[PDB]
Symmetry: D2
Subunit: 204 residues, 4 copies
């Protein structure tokens, strides 16, 4: 199916001075990699693709924190827009989980017999998603799909690819739009690349 | 300031004046606080948060699940301030569920709060007992400061008298849903704050 | 009939909202918050598409007061049309009404309206005289249909009885500014609709 | 100064199936050239640049219809957002004009521009001859300053040498539509900037 918006390995990105950038990170980012408004435009379209394939039965939206919170909130807002401007709509429930083994959610028995949409910020090797999916399938959901904002082109991939992708990106470390570098850079609406100064100041 | 005061005799708006998810058509009586009104109030709240807390690294604490919309929209408005001004501060986020010492579920170690400007984000304050006990727990990790932003505060004689630092709307003692406030997990997928209908209370009764 | 706002409606305190500093002392109350304007306009866009979405739409913006409603109304119409399975193209036009009965300045040859679904977008209907007259001028070129969306309709004893087809809000006979509604060319740069204070009315009096 | 966002001559664009596109233009478009969200992000930064240079005196924002209305609306929305989330801000008035094949159609009296800070807002500069002509008329009325913002500037050898003060994007010498930019009045109702396809150039040709 669709592999998303392909960002080539040689993408230059954009000069920071062409966009509005948080003052505290000005010296800490290299380039803007994916502008926030382009994330919205892509997400809008994924929202329609999601409803096409899953609007026929109750959806349980499952946000993988922390990185996924922003993508999850905006994906859901566009899905909500679809549901209030059209005759066809089905209820949605939401839940949140963090991965260490699953940390702090509803009991997974809520997923049984439901359309489960797992929402992720990034897929790298895909090992984590494979592991979460084999766990979720033990609870017998009607169906389980994975929406991920980014998929990284990496040789370390184990072969997993999600059902809805936003962008496919080089094997580069990106921050922003809730993706972090040691907890920092979540408070940034663009996806960006850290500068050298940057990763020093916030090294662990 | 108690925020935007909605009075006990406010009728709210007929469902037909607004766009409503069709599957909740029968289950809501009135729209209580339209989404765009929530946005406008949150915009102001974002400015008051930065004026008081912008001096030092903020840790924003979302109280799941009901707080997640208010949290994302408040942080969105704070982000918009920080990329359009000459002074801002880094801000990290964490998410927690709450169930005597209050049981905090998930979350980083609370030592991550030591010495930070901590902001707790809540969907609604009712008796105040939950924030009072969470505050009592957080102060023991020695934050620089700790403050609470709540979209909604209920006027109730059952209040233990706790007032949060930032409040969107002060509302009557009525059960409201929407904007991530649920009735048995339903109605989170609704952008307006609304009052639950009678058919809908029975239809979704646990 | 649209969102009805009553005579004794208080409005909202300026300090609960974000307000441009240069107008802080010039307004008495926020009358209709921006975000509430948007919520109603989303719904109106759906009515428009249902009634006129079957044939080419020509949307006519009545400058200057209409430009803000017009832009937002059309943006919610575009949002429907890239998320439906059957949409229709729309073209746009802009006009100003000058006396000496009504002169249509700017805008295309009215022959372009023949056979089209014509939507006239207006900021406020006061007496209804302007709209009645423009309608009679447009019906002369034989549009497939002509409809009026007005953001505001005033309640008045001096109304000549014209009623638009789509109404945002029905309001008292107060003097409101904001959201592109002006006083002596001022207050167009303000997202909320507000009532003008006495200080402000003197400060900008022509 | 900022030459704006430089879109190369070889830029491939994006496939239409990766974005939400109006149904009725499905076949009429080749690629998305500049997504609506990119335009927004860039405009947000032009609003800060505009304010930093013109924000010390009453601004008259002059929208050149019809192509400029979208960019005008969004630029002024980002400017308003700055003015209500900072301590100090300056008032702003708006006028609209249309050009005919040299002749300024509509608009207030050009004397309303004397001593003002005039911001002319344009969708596209190509040769620049029209902007030079417009400036030559505005300058007869002695503005305090006059500046031009253009969403798009074409890299063309046919350029007469004129450069605007604020530029969103520097684009190839090729024909784009959307975001109010039209082809025989069509494609204005589209939020992305895009390249017309063959079916489309033929379907709406003059
Ligand atoms: N910011 C950023 N993170 C990247 C990037 N590449 C890989 N990662 C990892 C990806 C994710 C989890 O890994 C599963 C992937 P897998 O498919 O390989 O198993 N991480 C977490 O820290 C989770 C905790 P959170 O932050 O959500 O609280 C960092 C990148 O380019 N940028
Ligand atoms: N939807 C809605 N809930 C209301 C309303 N009144 C009171 N509540 C409570 C508020 C909260 C508990 O907090 C007590 C705070 P208190 O200590 O100050 O009394 N609840 C939860 O279910 C938390 C789990 P969540 O849903 O977040 O996952 C229900 C109302 O009108 N509407
Ligand atoms: N701001 C504001 N104006 C009000 C209010 N009440 C009445 N008006 C009038 C209404 C409008 C003309 O409309 C008459 C339609 P009528 O024939 O039905 O009475 N005006 C214009 O100045 C048009 C030129 P513009 O401003 O678009 O360039 C002012 C109010 O409360 N607030
Ligand atoms: N859509 C689109 N138009 C382009 C493109 N290249 C040039 N044009 C022209 C540009 C403009 C006039 O401006 C002259 C600029 P110049 O003097 O600097 O050479 N036009 C109008 O039709 C104005 C009436 P409007 O439609 O606004 O009411 C079309 C392009 O790529 N796409
Ligand atoms: Mg993740
Ligand atoms: Mg991480
Ligand atoms: Mg709560
Ligand atoms: Mg609850
Ligand atoms: Mg008018
Ligand atoms: Mg007027
Ligand atoms: Mg032009
Ligand atoms: Mg043209």
């Amino acid at each position: 199916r669709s592999p998303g918006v392909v960002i080539s390995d040689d993408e230059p990105g954009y000069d920071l001075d062409l966009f509005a950038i948080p003052n505290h990170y000005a010296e800490d980012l290299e380039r803007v990699f994916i502008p926030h408004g382009l994330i919205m435009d892509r997400t809008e379209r994924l929202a329609r693709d999601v409803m096409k394939e899953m609007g026929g039965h109750h959806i349980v939206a499952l946000c993988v924190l922390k990185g996924g919170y922003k993508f999850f909130a905006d994906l859901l807002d566009y899905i909500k827009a679809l549901n209030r401007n059209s005759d066809r709509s089905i209820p949605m429930t939401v839940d949140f989980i963090r991965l260490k083994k699953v940390i702090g959610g509803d009991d997974l028995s809520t997923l049984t017999g439901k359309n489960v949409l797992i929402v992720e910020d990034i897929i790298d090797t895909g090992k984590t998603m494979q592991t979460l999916l084999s766990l979720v399938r033990q609870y017998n959901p009607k169906m389980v799909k994975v929406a991920s904002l980014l998929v990284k082109r990496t040789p370390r991939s184990v072969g997993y690819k999600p059902d809805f992708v936003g962008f496919e990106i080089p094997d580069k470390f990106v921050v922003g739009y809730a993706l972090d570098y040691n907890e920092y850079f979540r408070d940034l609406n663009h996806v960006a690349v850290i500068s050298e100064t940057g990763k020093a100041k916030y090294k662990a």
